Amino acid sequence: TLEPSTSITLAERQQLAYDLSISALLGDKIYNFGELLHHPIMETIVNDSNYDWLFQLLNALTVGDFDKFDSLIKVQISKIPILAQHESFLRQKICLMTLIETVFVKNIRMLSFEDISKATHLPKDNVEHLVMRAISLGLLKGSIDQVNELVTISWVQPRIISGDQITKMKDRLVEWNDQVEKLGKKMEAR
Amino acid sequence: AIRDEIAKNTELSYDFLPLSNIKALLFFNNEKETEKFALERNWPIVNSKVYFNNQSKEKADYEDEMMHEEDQKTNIIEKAMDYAISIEN
Amino acid sequence: HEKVTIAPLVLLSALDHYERTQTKENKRCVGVILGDANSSTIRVTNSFALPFEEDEKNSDVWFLDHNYIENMNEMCKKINAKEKLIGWYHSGPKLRASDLKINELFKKYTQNNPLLLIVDVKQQGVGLPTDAYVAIEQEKTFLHLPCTIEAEEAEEIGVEHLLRIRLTNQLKSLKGLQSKLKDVVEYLDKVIHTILGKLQDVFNLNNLQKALTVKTNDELMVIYISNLVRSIIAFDDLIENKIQNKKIQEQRVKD
Numbered sequence: 001t002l003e004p005s006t007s008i009t010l011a012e013r014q015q016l017a018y019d020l021s022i023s024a025l026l027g028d029k030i031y032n033f034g035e036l037l038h039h040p041i042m043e044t045i046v047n048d049s050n051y052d053w054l055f056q057l058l059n060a061l062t063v064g065d066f067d068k069f070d071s072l073i074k075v076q077i078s079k080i081p082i083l084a085q086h087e088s089f090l091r092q093k094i095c096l097m098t099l100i101e102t103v104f105v106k107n108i109r110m111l112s113f114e115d116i117s118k119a120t121h122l123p124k125d126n127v128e129h130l131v132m133r134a135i136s137l138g139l140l141k142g143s144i145d146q147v148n149e150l151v152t153i154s155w156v157q158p159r160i161i162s163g164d165q166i167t168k169m170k171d172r173l174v175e176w177n178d179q180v181e182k183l184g185k186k187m188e189a190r
Numbered sequence: 191a192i193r194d195e196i197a198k199n200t201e202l203s204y205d206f207l208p209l210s211n212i213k214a215l216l217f218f219n220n221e222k223e224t225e226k227f228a229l230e231r232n233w234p235i236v237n238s239k240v241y242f243n244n245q246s247k248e249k250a251d252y253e254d255e256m257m258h259e260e261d262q263k264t265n266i267i268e269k270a271m272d273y274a275i276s277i278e279n
Numbered sequence: 280h281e282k283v284t285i286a287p288l289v290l291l292s293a294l295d296h297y298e299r300t301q302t303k304e305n306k307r308c309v310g311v312i313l314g315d316a317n318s319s320t321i322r323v324t325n326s327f328a329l330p331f332e333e334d335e336k337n338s339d340v341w342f343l344d345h346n347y348i349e350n351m352n353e354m355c356k357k358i359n360a361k362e363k364l365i366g367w368y369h370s371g372p373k374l375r376a377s378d379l380k381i382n383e384l385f386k387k388y389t390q391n392n393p394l395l396l397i398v399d400v401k402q403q404g405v406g407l408p409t410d411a412y413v414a415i416e417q418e419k420t421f422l423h424l425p426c427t428i429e430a431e432e433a434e435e436i437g438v439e440h441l442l443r444i445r446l447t448n449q450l451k452s453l454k455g456l457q458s459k460l461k462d463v464v465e466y467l468d469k470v471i472h473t474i475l476g477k478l479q480d481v482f483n484l485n486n487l488q489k490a491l492t493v494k495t496n497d498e499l500m501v502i503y504i505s506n507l508v509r510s511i512i513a514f515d516d517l518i519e520n521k522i523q524n525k526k527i528q529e530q531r532v533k534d
Contacts, residue, residue, distance in 0.1 A: 038472070100483055100486065101486075102483075107486045108485075108486060109486065155483055158476055158479065158480055159476075159479070160475075160476055161472075162467070162475045165463075165479060165482060166460065166463055166464070169459070169482060170460070173453070173456040173457065173460065176456075179265060180450070180453060182262075183265040183268065184446060184449055186265075186269060187445065274510075
């Protein structure tokens with residue numbers, strides 16, 4: 001937050017957004033390009049001339065289509081295979097944060113090899129190596145069970161999303177309130 | 191009444207039994223009539239075999255906080271600990 | 280980190296200046312805490328009020344005399360030499376815009392980070408009638424330090440002479456989810472993610488205990504083994520006392 005200071009025009013905002021964007025191409029840490037959208041940047045800059053990578057890679061981490069981004073870019077960033085590797089981590093990290101409590105109802109943490117293969121658009125052999133490299137970089141924790149096909153990943157990387165935790169937090173509110181009327185009033189009326 | 195009493199034994203004592211044996215054990219004169227008795231007793235029927243999924247029991251009139259309850263299991267364990275305190279007090 | 284230790288002498292002293300000055304909701308009594316902020320344990324052994332005047336029409340208008348601030352701190356040195364200026368305290372249930380502008384006053388004579396304290400005479404809801412906060416900048420950033428109360432030997436015992444569990448724990452635990460739910464809904468309509476990110480960290484961290492659920496029931500049975508043996512010991516005294524009660528009755532029949 002700087003309201004009073006750092007006087008900047010539309011010319012330097014595009015130059016500043018360049019270093020901010022490229023930092024998130026290979027950056028696997030602290031959310032993704034959407035943080036640059038959270039700040040008044042994309043609205044203050046042009047939507048084309050390779051400034052649209054925030055919009056293309058936003059849905060690319062969900063649908064998992066690499067042909068949309070690679071077709072609109074040049075050969076500069078597509079020559080390095082590492083860029084295509086980091087895009088696979090952020091795609092899976094969205095679903096891996098849903099294992100405990102975000103969206104899913106029963107709040108039970110379980111992951112098989114078949115369910116994660118369809119979400120990451122990768123086979124069973126490449127998904128086992130992708131999780132191991134994700135934990136090795138410090139983004140995640142936990143262990144992996146290949147015998148029973150179980151994936152236990154400890155929650156590390158936070159997220160800025162909200163609105164899906166209000167309903168599931170009520171589950172702890174309603175289920176525990178029933179013991180106040182039954183068990184809670186049983187000991188009090190003793 | 192004897193055949194109905196045997197049907198209670200065939201549930202636990204037989205995990206899987208074919209159709210031809212049920213006719214011989216309970217003294218049935220028809221194979222089609224044999225499957226008719228399995229419908230009233232809720233017996234799953236597959237090819238040349240008869241299973242029993244009804245070994246698990248529930249309902250049985252009304253029961254509350256007794257005989258393997260459901261949602262009160264956590265509370266009753268803590269309730270039994272609070273009953274001995276008031277007896278001493 | 281650091282913790283704030285508020286002695287019962289300070290908590291009861293701030294409550295006295297509120298009633299004696301006939302302070303209504305339009306005014307808030309301001310005072311100065313005294314103690315040692317050097318170590319990680321911040322203890323306040325002394326407190327006193329100041330002739331403060333509050334104006335609700337303008338938050339930038341406050342009346343505070345700096346002469347009484349330096350004089351009283353110098354005159355109270357004769358009692359204990361461990362009393363210095365670690366910060367100040369003020370009254371009122373809420374923090375208004377006038378509290379942010381008065382934070383930079385005592386910072387001139389204060390070496391370490393000053394300490395702020397809010398005294399609530401009503402004490403409406405939960406615990407902690409006195410909340411402590413630290414004033415530090417990178418924009419003012421306030422952090423809530425853990426509030427504990429520890430006194431000397433004669434001070435803690437003197438309270439017991441003047442005054443001569445499970446249900447309460449479950450009530451405040453249920454209200455924690457109700458108060459948190461209202462903070463998320465009101466913040467949702469206020470924006471239309473940073474504040475909710477901290478609450479999501481705690482909320483996320485038989486769901487995760489399913490692996491330990493099997494080992495938990497085995498430990499609960501071992502606990503009951505000790506309780507079953509102690510129950511039999513208490514049952515033997517009942518039969519022993521029943522026989523002993525008859526020995527008294529046998530003496531009443533013969534005599």
